[PDB]
Amino acid sequence: QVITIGKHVKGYHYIIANLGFTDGDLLKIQFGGAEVSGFQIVDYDDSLV
Amino acid sequence: NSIQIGGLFPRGADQEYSAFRVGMVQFSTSEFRLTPHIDNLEVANSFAVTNAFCSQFSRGVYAIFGFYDKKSVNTITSFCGTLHVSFITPSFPTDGTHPFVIQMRPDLKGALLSLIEYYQWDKFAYLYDSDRGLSTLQAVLDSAAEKKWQVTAINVGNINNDKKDETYRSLFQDLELKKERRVILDCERDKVNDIVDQVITIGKHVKGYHYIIANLGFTDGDLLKIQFGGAEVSGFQIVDYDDSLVSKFIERWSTLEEKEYPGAHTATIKYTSALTYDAVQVMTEAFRNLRKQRIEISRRGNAGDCLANPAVPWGQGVEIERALKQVQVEGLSGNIKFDQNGKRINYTINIMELKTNGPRKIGYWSEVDKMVLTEDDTSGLEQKTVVVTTILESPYVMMKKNHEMLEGNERYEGYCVDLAAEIAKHCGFKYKLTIVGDGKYGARDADTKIWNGMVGELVYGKADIAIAPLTITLVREEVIDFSKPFMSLGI
Amino acid sequence: NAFCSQFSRGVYAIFGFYDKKSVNTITSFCGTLHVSFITPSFPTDGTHPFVIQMRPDLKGALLSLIEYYQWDKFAYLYDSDRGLSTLQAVLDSAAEKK
Ligand SMILES: NS(=O)(=O)c1cc2c(cc1Cl)N[C@H]([C@H]1C[C@H]3C=C[C@@H]1C3)NS2(=O)=O
């Protein structure tokens, strides 16, 4: 609904309060201009991961 | 009289062929019937167009209806101007005046020039598609040179699919270099639905941008995407849903089964299918009028090779085309008239602007008449030019010597005129400068309390504000209010 | 008529000129019938098979000459009969080099 009403340009700023930050959709507002930060506890770089 | 005709249809024009099948039995059969041999073949390969044309001429039909592409318009004109076979089409209108071609689509170009001159632009970008041709591109550059416009035209149509997510990003970021604001799109509906989605991904539909769609089915494409954006989107319609026969066809069209006619069980319809429907009306009016004048179209022999050396045609087809150019009925586009060549005149195009509730019209444009707005003034909130009363006093408010030539708020000059402009600049309202009638400052009446002058203009609700040399007293605070004092004085 | 007549004659190699209006007809016959066609006319736009063309391209040289003379603002008078590929070409460099 944000991406429909046009609130993801340069200037806005979003913080997601979850643990699976990349578990949701991020292809929508990737190219927007807004900046989006969040948290992870599952790091894909590691060996057993 | 089941009269042999020929039909050309692309592989994928299912809505158009279904609308033709509807219009086939929508009105016919008090008389002559039609014998349609349908060719569901391609249109890009002119060799395939040649094979289909010689096959239907080997059939020896009297008229052929169908589409053409820009790689085939020369072939169709070159064969029909030879063999005198009347050809009728809904596609893009031809460039040169060619004989034996009736073309169902109106002009767009004078309408689009009218729209740009109405919006009063000077500098814009023009994204075009090559495969629809370049006649509008040639037309806008002449008037851009004459009307001192600044056009950045960009070809976009040859871009492949597999890079079709980053090419548009590079394109609009190059448009960000000159900081573009005004875009005219000229594409097919598929390229429109592709480019709107990439705009709405990269975030270019806020308040500030402005888009003009150059098609005929302005609402035939998707508009739920950028309806709530902030950008403003305008386009053109030739199929108006308000009308009687239109809404009759809407109710007829919606109630049909999707399985029998694909793409039919919707609310709206394509303008191409609409012109395909009106084409049957024209084509049946033709053979109606030839039985009115009782002219026999007896071929009286077979046809043969299309490569006959030299081939010799038959001029009753010239009379067929002559009676075709005199057809004047009413249809989904409205009235129709033809020229001496087969091009359509006497049409009307509605100007359609997108709003929050949805699309709406603001005016029409005719074949000769320019843009006539329909005075749809739904602006419920107009900032009223507020009432400012004062009186002539030097150097507070003074006349100018050239007041008759000038107008209104320009006529007055002084300390108070300069002050009121500062107040309106800080407060953002509109104002009109007025004069008190009786020429007094104002006091109350004995025994009736009738405040005259500049007092009663504010007490009795006549005037709205008074920037003027007025003195704060005791007897004036009870009826009006004063700000903090701005200039001191004495007796 | 001429092309069908000479392929009925059984030609092994077709040569001739073309204008802007017959270019699709000849490339559409030659892509089907697989006959080698040779021309001095204007070059095409899309990569079509079986068409050899002696007239070289121009647009790179003309853009290089504009960059050498170091221009920004000019007029461009064109004729349509030879084609519009150069007109489509110089507008993109106008979009880039402002
Ligand atoms: N020197 S003068 O008469 O033109 C003049 C007189 C006045 C001015 C400003 C000027 Cl320039 N503003 C004051 C206001 C400022 C503040 C203090 C009182 C009022 C609030 N009122 S005033 O005393 O009426």
DSSP string, C13-64: SEE----SSSHHHHHHHHHHHT--EEE-S---SS--TTEEE-SPP-HHHHHH
CB-based touch C/B (3+ pairs, under 8 A): yes
Ligand 1: residue whose CA is nearest its atom 6: B487
Q: Is A1 on the interface with B (CB under 8 A)?
A: no
What is the CB < 6 Å shell around ligand 1? B 484-488
In sequence order, the 6+-apart residues with CB closer than 8 A to the CB of B326 are B289, B338
Cβ neighbourhood burial of B6 (10 Å; 0-12, 13-18, 19+): buried
Q: Is C47 on the interface with B (CB under 8 A)?
A: no
Q: Is A32 on the interface with B (CB under 8 A)?
A: yes
Closest CA to C23 of C7, C9, C3: C3
CA-CA distance, C93 to C98, in Å (whole number)? 8
How far is the centre of ligand 1, averaged over its atoms, from the C-alpha of B391 (Å)? 22
Report the gap between the CA of C59 and the closest CA in chain B (Å). 16
Q: Quick one: DSSP state of residue A1?
A: -
How far is the centre of ligand 1, averaged over its atoms, from the C-alpha of B484 (Å)? 8
- Given a contact cutoff of 8 angstroms between Cβ atoms, the answer to whether B268 and B237 are in contact is no
Identify the sign of the CA torsion B41, B45, B48, B54: positive
What residues of B are in contact with residue A3 (Cβ under 8 Å)?
A: 200
Q: Which of B169, B201, B205 to mutate to test the interface with A (most CBs of A within 10 A)?
A: B201
Q: φ, ψ for residue B237 (rounded to 5)?
A: -130, 140
Q: Which of B43, B47, B151 to mutate to test the interface with C (most CBs of C within 10 A)?
A: B47
Determine whether the interchain pair B74/C4 forms a contact, defined as Cβ–Cβ distance below 8 Å.
no
Closest CA to B108 of B132, B88, B87, B89: B132
What residues of A are in contact with residue B169 (Cβ under 8 Å)?
A: 31
Binding site: residue ranges of B? Answer: 469, 471, 476
CA-CA distance, B489 to B421, in Å (whole number)? 23
Of B169, B201, B228, the CB nearest to A5: B228
CB-based touch A/C (3+ pairs, under 8 A): no
Angle at B340 between CA B334 and CA B343, to 5 degrees: 45
Three-class secondary structure assignment of chain B: CCEEEEEEECCCCHHHHHHHHHHHHHCCCCCCCEEEEEEECCCCCHHHHHHHHHHHHHHCCCCEEECCCCCCHHHHHHHHHHHCCCEEECCCCCCCCCCCEEECCCCCHHHHHHHHHHHCCCEEEEEECHHHCCHHHHHHHHHHHHCCCEEEEEECCCCCCCCCCCHHHHHHHHHCCCCCCEEEEECCHHHHHHHHHHHHHHCCCCECEEEEECCCECCCCCCCCCCCCCCEEEEEECCCCCCHHHHHHHHHHHCCCCCCCCCCCCCCCCHHHHHHHHHHHHHHHHHHHHHHCCCCCCCCCCCCCCCCCCCCCCCHHHHHHHHHCCCCCEECCEECEECCCCCEECCEEEEEEECCCCEEEEEEEECCCCCEECCCCCCCCCCCCEEEEECCECCCEEECCCCCCCCHHHCEECHHHHHHHHHHHHHCCCEEEEECCCCCCCCCCCCCCCCCHHHHHHHCCCCCECCCCCCCCCCCCCCCCCCCCCCCCCC
> Judged by CB atoms within 8 Å, which residues 294-323 of B form the interface with C?
307, 309
Closest CA to B326 of B290, B272, B280, B276: B290
- Given a contact cutoff of 8 angstroms between Cβ atoms, the answer to whether B453 and B442 are in contact is yes
Ligand 1: residue whose CA is nearest its atom 8: B486
Q: How far apart are the first and last CA of chain A?
A: 34
- Given a contact cutoff of 8 angstroms between Cβ atoms, the answer to whether B120 and B150 are in contact is no
The count of other CB atoms within 10 Å of the CB of residue B211 is 21
- Given a contact cutoff of 8 angstroms between Cβ atoms, the answer to whether B23 and B276 are in contact is yes
CA-CA distance, B247 to A16, in Å (whole number)? 49
Element housing C5 (H / E): helix C2-9
How far is the centre of ligand 1, averaged over its atoms, from the C-alpha of B469 (Å)? 14
What does the block give as tokens for B271? Answer: 């303008």
Burial track B335-366 (b if 16+ CB lie within 10 A, e otherwise): ebebeebbbbeebebbbbebeeeebeebbbbe
Binding site for L-glutamate: residue ranges of B? Answer: 469, 471, 476
Please give the residue of chain A at the shortest CA–CA distance from B205: A6
- Tell me the CB-side half-sphere exposure of residue B167, using CA atoms within 13 A: 13
Q: What is the dihedral of CA B473, B476, B477, B480, to 10 degrees?
A: -140
- Given a contact cutoff of 8 angstroms between Cβ atoms, the answer to whether B214 and B108 are in contact is yes
- Given a contact cutoff of 8 angstroms between Cβ atoms, the answer to whether B39 and B278 are in contact is no
Closest CA to B313 of B81, B98, B65, B8: B81
Per DSSP, the three-state class of C93 is: helix
CA-CA distance, B204 to B181, in Å (whole number)? 10
CA-CA distance, A32 to B339, in Å (whole number)? 51
In sequence order, the 6+-apart residues with CB closer than 8 A to the CB of B243 are none
Please give the residue of chain B at the shortest CA–CA distance from C84: B134
Q: Is C21 on the interface with B (CB under 8 A)?
A: yes
CA-CA distance, B433 to B411, in Å (whole number)? 9
Per DSSP, the three-state class of C8 is: helix
What does the block give as tokens for B359? Answer: 């699309």
Cβ neighbourhood burial of B126 (10 Å; 0-12, 13-18, 19+): buried
- Beta strand pairing call for B123-128 and B182-186: parallel
Q: Is B152 on the interface with C (CB under 8 A)?
A: yes
Closest CA to B235 of B217, B251, B257: B217
What residues of C are in contact with residue B71 (Cβ under 8 Å)?
A: 24, 28
Of C1, C22, C84, the CB nearest to B134: C84
What does the block give as tokens for C21? Answer: 């209006």
Experimental resolution (Å): 4.2
Per DSSP, the three-state class of A35 is: strand
Ligand 1: residue whose CA is nearest its atom 1: B487
Burial track B276-306 (b if 16+ CB lie within 10 A, e otherwise): bbbbbbbbbbbbeebeeeeeebeeeeebeeb
